[PDB]
Amino acid sequence: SRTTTFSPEGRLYQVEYALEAINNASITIGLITKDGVILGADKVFISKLIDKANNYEKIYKIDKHIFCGVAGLNADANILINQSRLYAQRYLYNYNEVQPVSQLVVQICDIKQSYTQYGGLRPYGVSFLIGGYDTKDGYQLYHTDPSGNYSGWFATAIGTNNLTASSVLKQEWKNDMTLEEGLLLALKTLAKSTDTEIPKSEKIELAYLTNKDGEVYQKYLTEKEIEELIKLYTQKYIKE
Amino acid sequence: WYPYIDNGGTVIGLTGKDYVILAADTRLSLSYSIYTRFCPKISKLTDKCIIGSSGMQSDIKTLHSLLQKKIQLFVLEHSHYPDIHVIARLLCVILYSRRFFPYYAFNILAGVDENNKGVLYNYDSVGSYCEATHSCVGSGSQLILPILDNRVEQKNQLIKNTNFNLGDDINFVKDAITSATERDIYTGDKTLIYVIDKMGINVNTLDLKQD
């Protein structure tokens, strides 16, 4: 029935289907390094007639130091990004400083929680890996769900084939990870999740923060990841 | 446009053991010319509690009818005639319900509640009710209040006229109102000496100096 009604088991229905609706969406990888947080993506290819060179709809920008990698309904994702950009700017307008991500996910999971509680509207079939840098506790990487129960992490692989890709980060991840070593680490889990051995490079997109006291937050071009893809060939950080 | 005028008039209150005396004048004077010599300024509410007033008639006919509405709404919801202590607190909030635009009409609440207990409540135009044994309200406020002050409270070394029967006291209020028409302008001629004894009220009238 509607989202307002419960179930005899204690769970819900609309928020339970949304948790499964994101399982049929492309994967995204999160990863905290010793230099800055990095993200992964999977451009689902409906055809070869997309631009494939200027845009990508799996990783967006929230602020100059906060960025998320969305995974789920691409249509409903644009609303929360248009809603998180306001909270990331209304905090600046009210406190003259950057907003900590710990105070951003709370501000954004409440907008999801408010939908699965009243109004009689459908929930948000979206879940994303939102990370950033802050002066209070350094780099961080949070993860929201359609219910709102956010939680901090070090590496997450939501989308399709989560349990397999998350297991890769259980062993291959290390506490100390450089920026270049972290990219190669996140490159293999992004490729083996799609049951392939090498990315076609006209696929997956990556992003990285690495605050150099100014939070550069550079994204990646189709030519910049070629050098990263070539480094995977020689040094294979295999499935295992 | 000033929405506050004074029609002029007066109401005199007295007490004792089991009696209260409320008296007024019916001259509904306009700005400077007397219009009608008959406009009652006292209206009964219950069988043992009346109300007198002296401001503009716009804030008197409304205030007397609004009080009759909120008192008739209370009797058929409790099946008990209200006392004066409850009706005194009732006008305390009605007059304060319009604090920004106060009712330009001072009032007088007289009546008996217990077996004898002649009580008399008087207050200003904003709503600060205060019990009093005697009071005057209106255009002849500053002219009758000191006369009544020489009968209840004393300043004489010999406290004269300790007893106070209803017979002599009734002629005293007629003497005070007659003393108001000669020295004050707005004091009317047709007076209504309302006397509330234990059984009920009276409508004892008296015609004064048509001047």
Partner: protein, 224 residues
């Protein structure tokens, strides 16, 4: 009230996508010096004057739109499209960017899915136009998402209609050469072989204002 489903997909959206899969075919192809759009105008008779019923409308002096669904909805979304091309033009004195415009219409379409007691839009848009960052040709989905296409079709039987574009398209095609590869994707694609001034074609016309090609103008290209 268009709720979810146990399979994890909106059922009203999937039903809305079937409506655009059975309407007149719309087709847009970008080039290196402009963008072109086309629509098979199914003329039922000679009573309907061509200058009244159209499938190519304007949003500004540089933005072109194409419809592909419910004809009754061909105006309400247009009114809010032109209104957004004015609200951006009032504050910002320059022209409205296509990416800034398509993200607002996609947000308008989105709000007609989550709101209770409403119906999703029964159409697919094709926004095209000259921009300061090159050319663009976007496609709006009734679900609310938008794609940054290069050459696409959204009308009836587009699974095989796009097959002409997957094999007869190059990255560097001029706008005049792309007209014949678009007409071929309409005449040689399915029925409607009597293409004699029954196709509306809009072009970006190499950074000039949006030009709606007239019937006799298309006749020069209709000879091949």
């Amino acid at each position: 009230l268009t709720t979810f489903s146990p399979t994890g997909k909106l059922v009203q959206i999937e039903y809305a996508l079937n409506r655009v899969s059975s309407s007149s075919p719309a087709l847009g192809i970008r080039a290196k010096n402009g963008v072109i759009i086309a629509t098979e105008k199914k003329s039922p008779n000679e009573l309907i004057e061509e200058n009244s019923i159209f499938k190519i409308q304007q949003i500004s002096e540089h933005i072109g739109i194409v419809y592909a669904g419910m004809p009754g909805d061909f105006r309400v979304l247009l009114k809010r499209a032109r209104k957004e091309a004015i609200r951006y033009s009032l504050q910002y004195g320059s022209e409205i960017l296509v990416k800034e415009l398509v993200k607002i219409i996609a947000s308008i379409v989105q709000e007609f899915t989550q709101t209770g007691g409403v119906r999703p839009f029964g159409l697919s848009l094709l926004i095209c136009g000259v921009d300061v960052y090159g050319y663009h040709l976007y496609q709006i989905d009734p679900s609310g998402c938008y794609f940054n296409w290069m050459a696409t079709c959204v009308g009836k039987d587009y699974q095989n209609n796009m097959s002409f574009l997957e094999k007869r398209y190059n990255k560097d095609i001029e706008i005049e050469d792309a007209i014949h590869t678009a007409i071929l994707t309409l005449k040689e694609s399915y029925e409607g072989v009597l293409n004699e001034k029954n196709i509306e074609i809009g072009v970006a016309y190499d950074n000039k204002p949006f030009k709606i090609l007239t019937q006799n103008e298309i006749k020069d290209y209709l000879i091949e």
